[PDB]
Design a protein around this nucleic acid. Sequence first.
RNA 1: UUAAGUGAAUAAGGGCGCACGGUGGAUGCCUUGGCACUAGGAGCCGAUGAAGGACGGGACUAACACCGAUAUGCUUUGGGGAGCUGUAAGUAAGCUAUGAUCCAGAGAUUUCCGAAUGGGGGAACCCAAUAUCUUUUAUAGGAUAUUACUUUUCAGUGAAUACAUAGCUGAUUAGAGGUAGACGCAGAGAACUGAAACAUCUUAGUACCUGCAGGAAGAGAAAGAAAAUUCGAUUCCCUGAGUAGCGGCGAGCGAAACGGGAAGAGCCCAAACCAACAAGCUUGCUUGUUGGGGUUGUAGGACUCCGAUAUGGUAGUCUGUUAGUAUAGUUGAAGGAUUUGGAAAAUUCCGCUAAAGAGGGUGAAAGCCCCGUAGACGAAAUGCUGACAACACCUAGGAGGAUCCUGAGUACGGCGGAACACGAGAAAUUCCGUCGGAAUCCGCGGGGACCAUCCCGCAAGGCUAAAUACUCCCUAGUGACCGAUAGUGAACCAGUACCGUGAGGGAAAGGUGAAAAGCACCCCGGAAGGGGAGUGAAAUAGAUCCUGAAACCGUGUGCCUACAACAAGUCAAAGCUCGUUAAUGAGUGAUGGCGUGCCUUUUGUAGAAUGAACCGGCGAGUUACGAUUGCAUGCGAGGUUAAGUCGAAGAGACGGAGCCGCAGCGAAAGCGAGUCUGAAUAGGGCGAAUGAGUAUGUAGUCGUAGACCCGAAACCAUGUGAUCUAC
RNA 2: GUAGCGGAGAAAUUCCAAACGAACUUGGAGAUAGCUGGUUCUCUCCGAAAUAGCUUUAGGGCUAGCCUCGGAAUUGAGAAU
RNA 3: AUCCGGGAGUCAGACUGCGAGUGAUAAGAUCCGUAGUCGAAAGGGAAACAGCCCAGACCACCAGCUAAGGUCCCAAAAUAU
RNA 4: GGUGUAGUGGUAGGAGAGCGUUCUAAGGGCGUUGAAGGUCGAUCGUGAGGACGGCUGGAGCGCUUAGAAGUGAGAAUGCCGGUAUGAGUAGCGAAAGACAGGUGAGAAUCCUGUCCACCGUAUGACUAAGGUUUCCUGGGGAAGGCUCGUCCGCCCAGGGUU
RNA 5: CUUCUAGUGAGAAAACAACUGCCCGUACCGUAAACCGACACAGGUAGUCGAGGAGAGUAUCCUAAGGUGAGCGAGCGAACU
RNA 6: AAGCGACUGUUUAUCAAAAACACAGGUCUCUGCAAAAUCGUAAGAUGAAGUAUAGGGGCUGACGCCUGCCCGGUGCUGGA
RNA 7: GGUAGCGAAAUUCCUUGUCGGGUAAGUUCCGACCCGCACGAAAGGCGUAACGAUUUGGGCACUGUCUCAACGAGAGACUCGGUGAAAUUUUAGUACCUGUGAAGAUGCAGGUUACCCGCGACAGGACGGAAAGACCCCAUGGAGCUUUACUGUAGUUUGAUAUUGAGUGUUUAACCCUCUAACCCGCACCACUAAUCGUGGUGGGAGACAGUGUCAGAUGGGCAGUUUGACUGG
RNA 8: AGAAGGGAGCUUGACUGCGAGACCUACAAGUCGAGCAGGGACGAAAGUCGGGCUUAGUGAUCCGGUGGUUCCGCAUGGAAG
Lengths: 118, 154
Amino acid sequence: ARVKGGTVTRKRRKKVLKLAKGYYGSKHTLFKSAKEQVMNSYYYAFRDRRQKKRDFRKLWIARINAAARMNGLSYSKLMHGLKLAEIDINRKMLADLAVNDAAAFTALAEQAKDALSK
Amino acid sequence: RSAVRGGGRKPWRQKGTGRARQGSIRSPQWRGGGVVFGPTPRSYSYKLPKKVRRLAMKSVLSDKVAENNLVAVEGLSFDAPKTKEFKQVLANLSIDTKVLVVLENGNDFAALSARNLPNVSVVTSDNVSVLDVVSANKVLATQTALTQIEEVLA
RNA sequence: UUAAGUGAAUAAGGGCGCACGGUGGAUGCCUUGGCACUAGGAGCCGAUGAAGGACGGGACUAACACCGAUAUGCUUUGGGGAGCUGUAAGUAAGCUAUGAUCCAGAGAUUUCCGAAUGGGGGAACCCAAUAUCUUUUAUAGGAUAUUACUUUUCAGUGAAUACAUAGCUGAUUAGAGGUAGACGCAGAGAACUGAAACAUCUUAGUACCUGCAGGAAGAGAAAGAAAAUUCGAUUCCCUGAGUAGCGGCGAGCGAAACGGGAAGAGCCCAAACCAACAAGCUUGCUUGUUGGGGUUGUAGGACUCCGAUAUGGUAGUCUGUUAGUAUAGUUGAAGGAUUUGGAAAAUUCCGCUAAAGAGGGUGAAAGCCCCGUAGACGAAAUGCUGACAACACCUAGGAGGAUCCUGAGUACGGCGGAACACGAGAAAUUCCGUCGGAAUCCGCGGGGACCAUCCCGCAAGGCUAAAUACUCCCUAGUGACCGAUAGUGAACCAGUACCGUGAGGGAAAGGUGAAAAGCACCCCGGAAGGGGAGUGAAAUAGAUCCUGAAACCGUGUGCCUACAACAAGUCAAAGCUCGUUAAUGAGUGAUGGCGUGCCUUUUGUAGAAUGAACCGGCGAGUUACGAUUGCAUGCGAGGUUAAGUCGAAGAGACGGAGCCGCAGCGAAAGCGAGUCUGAAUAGGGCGAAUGAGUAUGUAGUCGUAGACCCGAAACCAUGUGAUCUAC
RNA sequence: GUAGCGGAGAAAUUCCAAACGAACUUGGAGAUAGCUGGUUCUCUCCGAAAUAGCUUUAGGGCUAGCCUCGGAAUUGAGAAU
RNA sequence: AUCCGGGAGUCAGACUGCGAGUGAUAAGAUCCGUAGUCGAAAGGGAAACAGCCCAGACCACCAGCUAAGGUCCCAAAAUAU
RNA sequence: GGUGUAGUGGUAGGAGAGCGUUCUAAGGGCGUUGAAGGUCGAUCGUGAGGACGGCUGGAGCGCUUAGAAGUGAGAAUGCCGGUAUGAGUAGCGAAAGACAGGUGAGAAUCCUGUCCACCGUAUGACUAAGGUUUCCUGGGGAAGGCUCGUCCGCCCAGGGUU
RNA sequence: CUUCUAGUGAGAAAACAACUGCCCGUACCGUAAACCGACACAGGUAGUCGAGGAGAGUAUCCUAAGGUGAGCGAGCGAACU
RNA sequence: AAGCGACUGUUUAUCAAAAACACAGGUCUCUGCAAAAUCGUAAGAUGAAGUAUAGGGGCUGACGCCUGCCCGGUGCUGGA
RNA sequence: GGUAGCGAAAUUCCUUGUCGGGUAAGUUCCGACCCGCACGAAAGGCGUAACGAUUUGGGCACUGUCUCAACGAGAGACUCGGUGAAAUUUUAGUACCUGUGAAGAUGCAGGUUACCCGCGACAGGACGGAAAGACCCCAUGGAGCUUUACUGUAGUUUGAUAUUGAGUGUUUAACCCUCUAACCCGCACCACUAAUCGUGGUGGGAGACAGUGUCAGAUGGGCAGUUUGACUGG
RNA sequence: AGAAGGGAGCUUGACUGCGAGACCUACAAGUCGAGCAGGGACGAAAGUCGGGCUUAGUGAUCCGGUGGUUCCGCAUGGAAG
């Protein structure tokens, strides 16, 4: 009882080629080229889910430094001041305030300045 | 490889030609070559020990009885082999499924009448197998044939 | 207006997404041909000219099928009943109800080559001799028979050498060659390989070559197997058993008899003696020819004595009588309407039939439309197999123990080789070469060197059915076998085209449609090709014709792109363009961070180490038989059958030979819950002390087999080459 | 005319059908290769070695050591202070 | 941990502390002993870097704290005292 | 079922559990109101993978439970087929032509003329091998001819050897 | 072919006339586009004939009888070969 | 002018034409004819329709002048 | 225990030996010398006219060989029309320097340079293409060759015995002989008969020898099958 | 140096059957051993003695030879083996 290899390989290969839409040239049209490229993209995406969380933290931190130097402080002294006062705002909300509500950011910077005035 | 009508000569040389070393026009990887490990003529049959044969026969008829799926009848007699009268008999006992008809002996008019009905199988009482009883929904056995089966299964 | 600043849009060409085409022939579905078997037949043809070929025969005839100057056919006996002159269209001439065509049995004709056979030869050609007959006035020309070689029988002639034997002429008798790439019995007879090298050994008396066969062959009727109490010709299967043995005691090789079965069957000569004839006429009875007698070990026969002169069988014939059988055929039940379609066998209603619901066809899927099927019937002729008839052959008891017979350069022995599972070994038994060489029933051979005793047989002569092996071929079927890169090398005009001096090697290539209805007519164009119009359910089904994938080549467009160093993506993200299996939507994307392919082999690879142009198809741990373990089921101090017989290629019962387990220790004699060593009751070794097995299924590993696939350089054995080159 | 265990050679290992330290074709034959290449779907649990000894042995193998799966067994036998 | 049983793979290692031999107290040399990493290990630091320093990735987050190493700009954090 | 605690890098290699292909049996189904196959989609599951919808297509095919295997492909300087790149690139195989006029859909290349040029112990004439119809006449232009072609040792039809 | 005998062995010499005489080949190429070289290929292929001037000549140059213009072209007038 | 080979000839078809091979001449040795030698299992053949001024085998290589010493070893021949 | 002859040689390591010649300058050439690593008399020694598509050194003549290049003719190349391949190829949007790294980078780090697309030319790199290194070692791989390597063998030789018989003598059974009938004849004549084959017949020669079978001892690279270890700074 | 060094007397324990338990070790091998039984040497005894102060002085299996034996012996009794 013989088993022809009819329509299984074409389905698997067309599933692979559909993931390669938008690539350059023979990297979206030939199966071997696309196979290798798709493997590399899997590697890159796993790597970059972890690197994302670092990039936004550096972005927030630099915006907060910029805002605080306008209120007579630097980033490190203002973070210490907020900790000595028991304030628990993220660096995300801090930067969001720094860009949207400058008066709220100044209220907070004054609390920090009074905390480390002791 | 060795049964395909083909070649014993080395097709090209072993080196120089910028090629791949090949040994015959009839190798498994050549188009038109011989098959590696195919089907061969084989047997497929074996035997189970004698007590479990007998245990399976008893068990399958006893299952038929434990659900009121065996139907006993005094006799099945016919002066001519007529299919129509057999179908009337079959409805006389309200039988509407696949049925094994177990007959006795040279009851040849009955077996002729019961052939050809597409729900009906006919077997004599010295020739019942395990596969005949499991496939049918009921058994229609005559009184004579029932004692004859009890005589051989003992 | 002048200065300073910021700055879009515009594509020669390219990218991404999408849409439509072209090329190409993957995929699906399908079969016209294959593969493995079962049951039955048949198992040879040939000098009365074979197997295989060449050349011919048609109204037109290149090819294939058929046939042979009587050429696409002739006669005859049966069957069948309306069309027919093959593929094969196309036309032209015809034939048939006074029975064509077609089908089965028996006949007739049958060029040329070939064993080829009157002589020759480079196969299908050439050249004769002798008789009879023909054309011609005649020679030249045409036809028919006969003419090889050997053997084996008989006449004539015949001689170195006289008698006659070689020889020669004539008449008679048989052979001769092919194959079924199979099966059998003989002669001669390798190597690579395994032994992890290699000589003995293995591969293996295998492959190859040569002879002889037959439908089967070979063996076959005890100079046998054994060991008390025996059995009776040969062959085949199960088991004994991987035992007893053989072996650089290594690799490895490896029985038989008993026990269970299939099938069964026995016969004929030589010799003594007795007659008829011929020669030696010893006129002794020595040589012989025909007929009779006689066939064995419990010894049998001759021979003498009486009984009987009947009765049991055959493996025999191209002799009769029927019975069947193979090869053609006959007959054979039961349905209409409705819906959707081009068309129903599909759907819905309401019926019928079955000893027939196996299968194939029909415009889609049919018990009831066609061919069939279950059942019933039939043969002029020829061939097979039974039965019963004739005819042919063969077959008798009891007693005696005076004498005669019972297979000679044989059995056997020395020397050299081989065959037996047995490699010279302590080497019986059976063969071949060489030399030596018995006895005669008061005898002769065997029981594994050899002797004695006991037991079983009677060599040196011939034949014989069945039970077992194989399938070129014919009939009827079958398959958890293939489905066009598969299955035969070959589904198709294949051992072909093609390649080679030759022996030899050897392919590719299936599919319109239900039906050719295969596109009349018009238009552009030399044509090819195309556009209308028509056929058709569909032509984007139009002959490169079912479906129509990818590489690869184009055309059109939404978004991006001419200051930019890019393993080509990934994460973050404005602008533009859309709007989906509706949800935290889709395409493109300026700009920013990060980032040296895939596989193999390596201590270690982006590797300047290795492989791949790309796309598609194909392409690698399988089976048989053994051994072991785990799981599972049935029985349990027990478990289980093998070959074989009946049965549907099956289930589904018989069959207890045999196998494992239930007790061990010891080299063995032997002893036994113990035994061996030992002077030992000592000590110690191995065992017991409730301590579970066996059959089958399934999976993991191993052994013997090519054993997961591919890859050498080489070795051996038949054959083909001096049309090139050397003498 | 001479043919492969062979022929022929004013001798070069020279020629024997474009290839001769031993022609070509078919068969033994699926020769052998401790070497080189290749060996096709998925997820879950565990997870080595590159050492010793002996080897006509040194890029091969065998026994032990080191991994994994199933069972049995008295324990308090393993480890770290 | 030990005992019985089924199935293996490995027998070319490399560098870095430390302590010895051969060498010239040369070698990214060679051969032993002892510990780690690599082999078979991704992630941060060391410009780039198998073997060094920190640390062992089941998966999701635009949340937080630290290690080695750092805080003028490239480039996150002190132009700290 | 809850809740706690602990774990979850991995080559050689051991162990477990599954996905998909073809065929067999039994059962329950679908199909010209359109099966398999092909193409597109923004859909589901932890993975191999599973659906549903459009277009194409024209006759067969799923699902459940068990069984059997020629059962899964990216690589072997693998085998067969089809198509690219190099690229409109190398080459187009010794040599003298020019013009007028014909034919024709179409002429550097075919026909006819005129002048020019080349061989001439040969590039002239005859013959033995070898080939095997290539020879003559009338038509043709799809392929062969290294361009072209109205032409030909090519293709079709007839004929020729005394 | 020519003689000489041996020899089965009517009688044939030569005039004219008129009659008879079988089989196979025969086309065409053949220093080549028709043969051997896979090709319409700068190679190879036995024999006979093979003219004039000047010359010993079949050498050499130009010509007679006869044959041929050779199956890709038109421009330009660089490097380099 | 010098080396090598007397000379004409032959050779690695397709990287070597030569100082290499051959050669006329020298010398040693075998062979009484069914010769020795060679092909072949043998039959049959060449040698040769030859007969020691002939035929086979080894070395040297026109021609000129010449060709020393050794018979312990090894082959060959003769011995008893 | 090397004679005649020759000798830094087609032979000489040291070595470009030393001396003379030839050149302005000579490790090559020619002449000589003898300290011949390692000439030497038929695997011949030393001369030698003629000859050589041989090898070497020097002169005259002639020159694009060179100083040192220039011009000109034709064919390809270049542009246009017709026709139309190949080896190669993981995908490519394919710069330089100094470093890093399987220790020599277009692609990795830090810098430096650079608008997009082609045409004619040159060969530095792509460890450029073509050929699974011919060099070296391994496989307990092959094959051809050698021999005083192992084990065999064809051929040649020597004995016993069969074919195979008869008589005398000489010695301790063996031996020397003589005979003729086997066996042999590649001698002559004769017949079958067209015959140098063959078979028969008669002479002659030779003779129990030879040839042939079985067994035995020698010899036997003529020919055959094989073996010829490992460790190792290759 | 309570000798294991050196003298003198008597002797053959340089014994037979063994062996609880350890050591070494992949295997095959290697090493030590108290104590029991038979029969002894030396010594008045107690006792010591299964070679030498200790650790090198050796070679599996197959095959063959010599001596012993209350073992087997292919119909039986022997023999060959």
